[PDB]
Design an enzyme around this catalytic site. Structure first.
Site, PDB file in Angstrom:
ATOM      1  CB  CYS A 185       3.627   0.316   0.971  1.00 29.02           C
ATOM      2  SG  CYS A 185       4.425  -1.286   1.291  1.00 29.02           S
TER       3      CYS A 185
ATOM      4  CD1 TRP B 255       7.957 -10.139  -0.651  1.00 30.81           C
ATOM      5  CD2 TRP B 255       8.950 -10.201   1.347  1.00 30.81           C
ATOM      6  NE1 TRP B 255       6.984 -10.369   0.294  1.00 30.81           N
ATOM      7  CE2 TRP B 255       7.564 -10.390   1.531  1.00 30.81           C
ATOM      8  CE3 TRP B 255       9.794 -10.206   2.474  1.00 30.81           C
ATOM      9  CZ2 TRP B 255       6.991 -10.584   2.788  1.00 30.81           C
ATOM     10  CZ3 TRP B 255       9.228 -10.389   3.731  1.00 30.81           C
ATOM     11  CH2 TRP B 255       7.841 -10.584   3.878  1.00 30.81           C
TER      12      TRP B 255
ATOM     13  CD  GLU C  24       7.288  -4.079  -6.655  1.00 26.63           C
ATOM     14  OE1 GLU C  24       7.873  -2.996  -6.390  1.00 26.63           O
ATOM     15  OE2 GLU C  24       7.315  -5.081  -5.908  1.00 26.63           O
TER      16      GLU C  24
HETATM   17  C1  HEM Z   1       7.794  -6.838   2.733  1.00 21.83           C
HETATM   18  C2  HEM Z   1       7.304  -6.823   1.482  1.00 21.83           C
HETATM   19  C3  HEM Z   1       6.888  -5.529   0.713  1.00 21.83           C
HETATM   20  C4  HEM Z   1       6.107  -5.545  -0.371  1.00 21.83           C
HETATM   21  C5  HEM Z   1       5.481  -6.830  -0.975  1.00 21.83           C
HETATM   22  C6  HEM Z   1       5.942  -4.189  -0.850  1.00 21.83           C
HETATM   23  C7  HEM Z   1       5.190  -3.780  -1.938  1.00 21.83           C
HETATM   24  C8  HEM Z   1       5.167  -2.520  -2.513  1.00 21.83           C
HETATM   25  C9  HEM Z   1       4.772  -2.171  -3.872  1.00 21.83           C
HETATM   26  C10 HEM Z   1       4.296  -3.170  -4.952  1.00 21.83           C
HETATM   27  C11 HEM Z   1       4.895  -0.848  -4.019  1.00 21.83           C
HETATM   28  C12 HEM Z   1       4.612  -0.019  -5.284  1.00 21.83           C
HETATM   29  C13 HEM Z   1       5.939   0.408  -5.903  1.00 21.83           C
HETATM   30  C14 HEM Z   1       5.810   0.649  -7.387  1.00 21.83           C
HETATM   31  O1  HEM Z   1       4.755   0.302  -7.953  1.00 21.83           O
HETATM   32  O2  HEM Z   1       6.757   1.179  -8.026  1.00 21.83           O
HETATM   33  C15 HEM Z   1       5.387  -0.299  -2.770  1.00 21.83           C
HETATM   34  C16 HEM Z   1       5.647   1.028  -2.502  1.00 21.83           C
HETATM   35  C17 HEM Z   1       6.210   1.502  -1.317  1.00 21.83           C
HETATM   36  N1  HEM Z   1       6.575   0.740  -0.221  1.00 21.83           N
HETATM   37 FE1  HEM Z   1       6.323  -1.298   0.083  1.00 21.83          FE
HETATM   38  N2  HEM Z   1       6.661  -3.362  -0.002  1.00 21.83           N
HETATM   39  C18 HEM Z   1       7.272  -4.147   0.962  1.00 21.83           C
HETATM   40  C19 HEM Z   1       8.095  -3.661   1.974  1.00 21.83           C
HETATM   41  C20 HEM Z   1       8.262  -2.337   2.321  1.00 21.83           C
HETATM   42  C21 HEM Z   1       9.075  -1.804   3.404  1.00 21.83           C
HETATM   43  C22 HEM Z   1       9.929  -2.706   4.321  1.00 21.83           C
HETATM   44  C23 HEM Z   1       8.942  -0.453   3.399  1.00 21.83           C
HETATM   45  C24 HEM Z   1       9.567   0.613   4.320  1.00 21.83           C
HETATM   46  C25 HEM Z   1      10.164   0.300   5.475  1.00 21.83           C
HETATM   47  C26 HEM Z   1       8.020  -0.096   2.326  1.00 21.83           C
HETATM   48  C27 HEM Z   1       7.594   1.183   1.976  1.00 21.83           C
HETATM   49  C28 HEM Z   1       7.097   1.582   0.745  1.00 21.83           C
HETATM   50  C29 HEM Z   1       7.035   2.924   0.219  1.00 21.83           C
HETATM   51  C30 HEM Z   1       7.500   4.187   0.965  1.00 21.83           C
HETATM   52  C31 HEM Z   1       6.496   2.878  -1.001  1.00 21.83           C
HETATM   53  C32 HEM Z   1       6.247   4.065  -1.958  1.00 21.83           C
HETATM   54  C33 HEM Z   1       7.464   4.094  -2.875  1.00 21.83           C
HETATM   55  C34 HEM Z   1       7.277   5.127  -3.949  1.00 21.83           C
HETATM   56  O3  HEM Z   1       6.329   5.941  -3.821  1.00 21.83           O
HETATM   57  O4  HEM Z   1       8.069   5.140  -4.929  1.00 21.83           O
HETATM   58  N3  HEM Z   1       7.639  -1.271   1.705  1.00 21.83           N
HETATM   59  N4  HEM Z   1       5.531  -1.342  -1.876  1.00 21.83           N
HETATM   60  C1  LIG Z   2      10.737  -1.805  -0.241  1.00 20.42           C
HETATM   61  C2  LIG Z   2      10.061  -2.094  -1.558  1.00 20.42           C
HETATM   62  C3  LIG Z   2       9.401  -3.302  -1.808  1.00 20.42           C
HETATM   63  C4  LIG Z   2       8.768  -3.501  -3.056  1.00 20.42           C
HETATM   64  N1  LIG Z   2       8.152  -4.685  -3.302  1.00 20.42           N
HETATM   65  N2  LIG Z   2       8.824  -2.550  -4.013  1.00 20.42           N
HETATM   66  C5  LIG Z   2       9.450  -1.353  -3.766  1.00 20.42           C
HETATM   67  C6  LIG Z   2       9.493  -0.459  -4.684  1.00 20.42           C
HETATM   68  C7  LIG Z   2       9.477   0.394  -5.488  1.00 20.42           C
HETATM   69  C8  LIG Z   2       9.353   1.429  -6.523  1.00 20.42           C
HETATM   70  N3  LIG Z   2      10.632   2.143  -6.669  1.00 20.42           N
HETATM   71  C9  LIG Z   2      10.852   2.530  -8.068  1.00 20.42           C
HETATM   72  C10 LIG Z   2      12.259   3.114  -8.152  1.00 20.42           C
HETATM   73  C11 LIG Z   2      12.446   4.284  -7.178  1.00 20.42           C
HETATM   74  F1  LIG Z   2      11.817   5.362  -7.616  1.00 20.42           F
HETATM   75  F2  LIG Z   2      13.726   4.546  -7.088  1.00 20.42           F
HETATM   76  C12 LIG Z   2      11.940   3.958  -5.779  1.00 20.42           C
HETATM   77  C13 LIG Z   2      10.550   3.341  -5.822  1.00 20.42           C
HETATM   78  C14 LIG Z   2      10.079  -1.114  -2.542  1.00 20.42           C
END
Ligand code: HEM
Ligand SMILES: Cc1cc(N)nc(C#CCN2CCC(F)(F)CC2)c1
Ligand code: HEM
Ligand SMILES: Cc1cc(N)nc(C#CCN2CCC(F)(F)CC2)c1
Ligand SMILES: C[C@H](O)[C@H](O)[C@H]1CNc2nc(N)[nH]c(=O)c2N1
Ligand SMILES: C[C@H](O)[C@H](O)[C@H]1CNc2nc(N)[nH]c(=O)c2N1
Ligand SMILES: [Cl-]
Ligand SMILES: [Cl-]
Ligand SMILES: [Gd]
Ligand SMILES: [Gd]
Ligand SMILES: [Gd]
Ligand SMILES: [Zn+2]
Lengths: 401, 401
Positions: free
Chosen positions: B105, B277, B282
């Site tokens: 994240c 958000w 993405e």
């Molecule tokens: C508030 C604005 C947020 C932004 C801008 C953001 C941004 C991102 C981005 C760009 C990714 C990469 C996902 C991808 O490339 O497919 C990511 C992954 C992730 N985020 Fe954040 N996120 C936000 C909020 C949150 C919140 C609220 C949580 C949990 C409470 C969270 C937990 C995670 C997790 C667990 C992943 C890994 C997901 C995966 O491995 O598929 N994020 N985030």
């Molecule tokens: C909370 C949040 C904020 C943000 N900006 N992006 C994400 C994401 C994602 C990636 N997503 C791809 C599809 C999935 F495998 F089902 C779950 C993981 C989540």
């Protein structure tokens, strides 16, 4: 036990069985991954056997005639003298294999077309210089670039070392001001300080080609001027942005790394420069746009009248792509070999499949194979990769000061 | 202690937090596998013990009355029931830490600002639905997005799991075709088949919002349609390319991941959807330009009158940058929160400085943090990183089908 490796664009699965051979342990542990960090007596006989055994299996000559034979003379060579000399073809075969084993090189589809210059019968900086000068001229070839490595004499105890003090054979100057900051290339500021130290008159320009500092064993270095007509450079112009030429930007034709240590069969060549041709992002994205390099990105964006007041206008993205377009256009008009990051990554995907069939895998460093712009638009982004250490190899080494 | 360098600036820190990494990762000293996407009372006790220790450090009451009381309490509850219950304050802290600890994240500057909805009294799939609608409503907030997570009942002996079968609360259908192609989002063909199999009457658009499949324990999944006026969407247009609006492209406002397992003190919450958000890459780069997703890149480039017959024109790079411009402009026009990759990565650099002073480090997955376009234009490219697993944590889990 054999890592499962997926490609996410297509869904294909492979298993890296080649990983089973890794010698020099990497920086990672089950506790933490360190894959994104840049720089993370008779042991000589173990690596010697292993290398010789490779050679002959690669020529379908395992367990036959000259294989048995060649194992003894190196055994005898180390026994009497504590080291050994490589048969010319072996030096050729090991140099190509090292390139083949470089995980951070995206251009390895080319690994079998390598011209090896044997400089093992060398002594003195004057001797180095003409060897380097023959390399540069052969590799440049009036812009039709040709991969080449020059292999200077191996390392022995008691004697000093052959070392090229520049990180590349062609690098630009870096001069400070009445205010610490730099004119020219900031990456090289330090070797520019050693050159001026050793009695070179600094120029004014932002694109002065540094003089070489060449080091014969146990003797302090010697400054050399390169023959200017031997240093092929490309003035940078854009195909449709007429003001771009006026920014006075240039880059040299030949990427020739002169600071890594070639290790074959257990011998260590601290001076062994290899050269290829550039991928355009190396110049247009890293050399020209890195904030700690020439850092030109905002100057081009002003010239394009982009809105630098909000990052969400992606003015950085826009200026960077144009700088890359100008590199590709300038090299192609100057008829100098260059490859764009799309062509190069697709050839690397071709390399990966070749190597799956041939050797059961390929060590690849994902952070370095993926290009520094447009990552996910190239197919390597969606390919999982395994990173490990095979021999023979190119290895980093301390600066000789 | 791993030494970590910033290459843009020269900074050097040591990651002492990595020394506390609990669960093991996929790499060994032989081979790095960082680039891979998907790499007993006493132990429940020791996880819980460590979390409780953590919680009491955060309230500046370590080693206190209430601290040992809770430790004692939890062991008594594990002995009596085989499990234990989180207090509400501990649940809020453990969900915030799970976000803090998530290595992939880039949004974690925001980790402390998180709205925790405790749905651990949820009784059925129907109540589950109601809780999810309220989450979507609160988090969407008419385009001014707020980060939230709803936590459904924990896994426990004797009863099955609550599960949301959908990978996100808002996702678009993907229908296979007459000619074997896919209409809509191909990432979602499988769940779409499941919805239809479970009584959903499909549409046949490219942006059909999927119904929810919600599993109460020891129940088949139950189908729930989302009220159209709960799912905020954004028609996509480009600030200067007026033909762009005619592509008919949309994306939804709320990214709500619903297939991950929240782990706190050894307890497991297989159903705990969270949402933030979007970062514009993405949507713009991955969701629309990936060849296996909507794959609009060539169509955009033709329309731009780029020369798509040679990769060296950088048509792909140019068309992708305009697609991101359109995503950002569209979300700003609609007044729906969005962050570009330059602002996002700069705030993540502040997160790593905050986290170094606070904990002595920060788990980061370089290949996920660095954006899929313009990587070395963002400061995270030039930042070395240490990847490891801290608890509390969000974990992947198998698909319930
Ligand atoms: C508030 C604005 C947020 C932004 C801008 C953001 C941004 C991102 C981005 C760009 C990714 C990469 C996902 C991808 O490339 O497919 C990511 C992954 C992730 N985020 Fe954040 N996120 C936000 C909020 C949150 C919140 C609220 C949580 C949990 C409470 C969270 C937990 C995670 C997790 C667990 C992943 C890994 C997901 C995966 O491995 O598929 N994020 N985030
Ligand atoms: C909370 C949040 C904020 C943000 N900006 N992006 C994400 C994401 C994602 C990636 N997503 C791809 C599809 C999935 F495998 F089902 C779950 C993981 C989540
Ligand atoms: C002929 C075309 C070639 C192309 C297009 C190419 C491309 C590249 C690129 C883009 C890098 C990334 C380096 C960086 O960003 O600093 C790299 C690394 C590397 N290449 Fe190649 N290369 C070529 C030829 C060669 C040859 C001939 C050799 C050796 C015989 C070689 C050995 C290496 C090594 C050792 C590295 C690692 C460099 C480092 O760690 O700093 N390459 N290559
Ligand atoms: C053979 C070859 C082909 C190619 N396309 N690029 C390279 C490179 C590089 C960048 N070089 C900068 C100087 C250094 F840090 F010392 C080593 C890394 C080398
Ligand atoms: C710290 C980080 O790994 C470092 O910036 C790397 C990333 N990938 C790279 N890739 C290439 N080809 N060259 C580089 O210098 C770098 N730098
Ligand atoms: C194979 C490769 O690791 C894979 O494509 C990863 C790379 N980095 C990523 N990074 C982010 N943020 N999201 C992703 O989906 C991916 N995909
Ligand atoms: Cl270079
Ligand atoms: Cl998404
Ligand atoms: Gd002007
Ligand atoms: Gd227009
Ligand atoms: Gd069309
Ligand atoms: Zn690793």
């Amino acid at each position: 036990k054999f890592p499962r490796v997926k490609n996410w664009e297509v869904g294909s699965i492979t298993y890296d069985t080649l990983s089973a051979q890794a010698q020099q342990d990497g920086p990672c542990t089950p506790r933490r991954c360190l894959g994104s960090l840049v720089f993370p007596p008779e042991q000589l006989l173990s690596q010697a056997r292993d290398f010789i055994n490779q050679y002959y299996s690669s020529i379908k000559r395992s367990g036959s005639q000259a294989h048995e034979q060649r194992l003894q003379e190196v055994e005898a060579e180390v026994a009497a003298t504590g080291t050994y000399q490589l048969r010319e073809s072996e030096l050729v075969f090991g140099a190509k294999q090292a390139w083949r084993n470089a995980p951070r090189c995206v251009g390895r589809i080319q690994w079998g077309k390598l011209q090896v210059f044997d400089a093992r019968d060398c002594r003195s900086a004057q001797e180095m210089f003409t060897y380097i000068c023959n390399h540069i001229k052969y590799a440049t070839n009036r812009g039709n670039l040709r991969s080449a490595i020059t292999v200077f004499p191996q390392r022995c105890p008691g004697r000093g070392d052959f070392r090229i003090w520049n990180s590349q054979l062609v690098r630009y100057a870096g001069y400070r001001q009445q205010d610490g900051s730099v004119r020219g290339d900031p990456a090289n500021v330090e070797i520019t300080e050693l050159c001026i130290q050793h009695g070179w008159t600094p120029g004014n320009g932002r694109f002065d080609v540094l003089p070489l500092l060449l080091q014969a064993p146990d003797e302090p270095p010697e400054l050399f001027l390169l023959p200017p007509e031997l240093v092929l450079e490309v003035p940078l112009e854009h195909p449709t942005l007429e003001w771009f030429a006026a920014l006075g930007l240039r880059w040299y034709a030949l990427p020739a790394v002169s600071n890594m240590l070639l290790e074959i069969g257990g011998l260590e060549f601290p001076a062994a420069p290899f050269s290829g041709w550039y991928m355009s992002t190396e110049i247009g994205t890293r050399n020209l746009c890195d904030p700690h390099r020439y850092n030109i990105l905002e100057d081009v964006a002003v010239c394009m009248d982009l809105d630098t007041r909000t990052t969400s206008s992606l003015w950085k993205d826009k200026a960077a792509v144009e700088i890359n377009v100008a590199v590709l256009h300038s090299y192609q008009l100057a008829k100098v070999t260059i490859v764009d990051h799309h062509a190069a990554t697709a050839s690397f995907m071709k390399h990966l499949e070749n190597e799956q069939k041939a050797r059961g895998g390929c060590p690849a460093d994902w952070a370095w194979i993926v290009p520094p712009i447009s990552g996910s638009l190239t197919p390597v982004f969606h390919q999982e990769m395994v990173n490990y250490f095979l021999s023979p190899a190119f290895r980093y080494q301390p600066d000789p000061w």
